[PDB]
Design a protein around this nucleic acid. Structure first.
Lengths: 135, 74, 70, 128
RNA sequence: UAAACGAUGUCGACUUGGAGGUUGUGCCCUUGAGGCGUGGCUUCCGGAGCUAACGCGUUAAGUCGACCGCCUGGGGAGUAC
């Protein structure tokens, strides 16, 4: 087993859609005997350089422990996917499960603090500029 | 101190974190410029084992679009 | 080669410039130039080198000064 | 060349806004005023300022450029302007500025010189 | 193939130091971009000393031992057989 940080960037949007998709991303590693450690997130955010053709995004991290050759499934899940525009992995020596400075903290940060980055906002504007009901 | 230790804060002159980390940006503000390049040790007196770690992290982040790289971006 | 204004912005009547910007840097460097493996230490940077130069000249300077002679 | 009795009377487009562009060399100097939509409305140089050969590389230039160009644009009706600056040749406040000056605006000055990460690379011209 | 680098075969002990860099590590009336302790690595200066001289000098080209590689005018020539 292993221990990983996994950060990913969502198209703004899809930022409210991926929290209903977390099952999946967990799984993968929970199928395996891996675990989630963590799930936070930052809001959202500005980029940096535009990604995709937009300057904004929504940042999230999951994280996980895990088999060192099965992590990967999670990388492959992001990647094909979408949403996520993105993602990066590092690792965390069993441990850095804590959490990030913008969440520890939030709160100060946000109001207070600050942040320069982030685009909170957006998100929020979104209430709205964004609307979806299909997948 | 002694039998007093730890505790009295001592150390952090250097650099404020002594770590690689990138989550965070920020402190990394810092160690960047108006043209996306990193600030050299060095000009700061930082350390290094912490220059590196600062950076990286700046590089990472950035490759997560959290910090500018050229510049461009600024 | 102008200074960025961004923070902050002068009026406009204002000047900017004052203070710096992170300009001038880049790939310039190779215009031109070059590349060599060790030659950059005397072509470039350097420094090698200068290092004690600096101390060192200050010694040195006194030293010189001290006698001192100057 | 003669020129008429006149001038100019005017204009265009009367844009009010615009941006910007000064580029730069040993080398160089080209000045183009736009916009924002980019874009551009008049241009510029530097050689066209009549200096160039060798340089047209001079800060005098660039000042002529920029005057220039800007200007250009007086026929395109600037009120504002902002300025983007590029390349290792003449630059920076006196080249602005210049316009600015002009009676335009101008506050911002930026920078925007290209710097790739790295490759692409220049020649070994040279040697020494 | 190389001016393929210490222009200096590999290994190991001994023999004045100073100043700068780096890193595992001891302790710390813990003060700092720091103080003192203990090893590894490293750069510049230089004593003793060697060397034709420049130079090298505790990472020796000083003081010593083992094993290995190379030299015995220049041109003909790293050329031919």
């Amino acid at each position: 087993m292993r221990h990983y940080e996994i950060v990913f960037m969502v198209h703004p949007d899809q930022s409210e859609q991926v929290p209903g998709m977390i099952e999946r991303y967990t799984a993968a590693i929970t199928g395996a005997e891996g675990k989630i450690h963590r799930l936070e997130d930052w809001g959202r955010r500005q980029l940096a350089y535009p990604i995709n053709k937009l300057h904004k995004a929504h940042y999230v991290l999951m994280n996980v422990e895990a088999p060192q050759e099965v992590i990967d499934e999670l990388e492959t899940t992001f990647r094909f996917n979408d949403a996520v525009i993105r993602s990066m992995v590092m690792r965390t020596k069993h441990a850095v499960t804590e959490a990030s400075p913008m969440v520890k903290a939030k709160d100060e940060r946000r109001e207070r603090r600050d942040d320069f980055a982030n685009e909170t906002a957006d998100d929020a504007e979104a209430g709205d500029s964004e609307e979806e009901e299909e997948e | 101190a002694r039998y007093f230790r730890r505790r009295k804060f001592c150390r952090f002159t250097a650099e404020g974190v002594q770590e690689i980390d990138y989550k965070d940006i920020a402190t990394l503000k810092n160690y960047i410029t108006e043209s996306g390049k990193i600030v050299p040790s060095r000009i700061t007196g930082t350390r290094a084992k912490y220059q590196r770690q600062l950076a990286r992290a700046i590089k990472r982040a950035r490759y997560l679009s959290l910090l500018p790289y050229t510049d461009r971006h600024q | 080669p102008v200074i960025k204004v961004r923070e902050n912005e002068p009026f406009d009547v204002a000047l900017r410039r004052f203070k710096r910007s992170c300009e001038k840097a880049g790939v310039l460097a190779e215009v031109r130039r070059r590349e060599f493996y060790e030659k950059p230490t005397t072509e470039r940077k350097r420094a090698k080198a200068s290092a004690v130069k600096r101390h060192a000249k200050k010694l040195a300077r006194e030293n010189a000064r001290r006698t001192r002679l100057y | 060349a003669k020129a008429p009795i006149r001038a100019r009377k005017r204009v265009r487009k009367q844009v009010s806004d615009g941006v910007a562009h000064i580029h730069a060399s040993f080398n160089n100097t080209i000045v183009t005023i736009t916009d924002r939509q980019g874009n551009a409305l008049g241009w510029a140089t530097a050689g066209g300022s009549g200096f160039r050969g060798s340089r047209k590389s001079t800060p005098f230039a660039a000042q002529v450029a920029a005057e220039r160009c800007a200007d250009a644009v007086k026929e395109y009706g600037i009120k504002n302007l902002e300025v983007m600056v590029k390349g290792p040749g003449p630059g920076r406040e006196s080249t602005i500025r210049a316009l600015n000056a002009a009676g335009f605006r101008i506050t911002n000055i930026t920078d925007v010189t290209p710097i790739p990460h790295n490759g692409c690379r220049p020649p070994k011209k040279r040697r020494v």
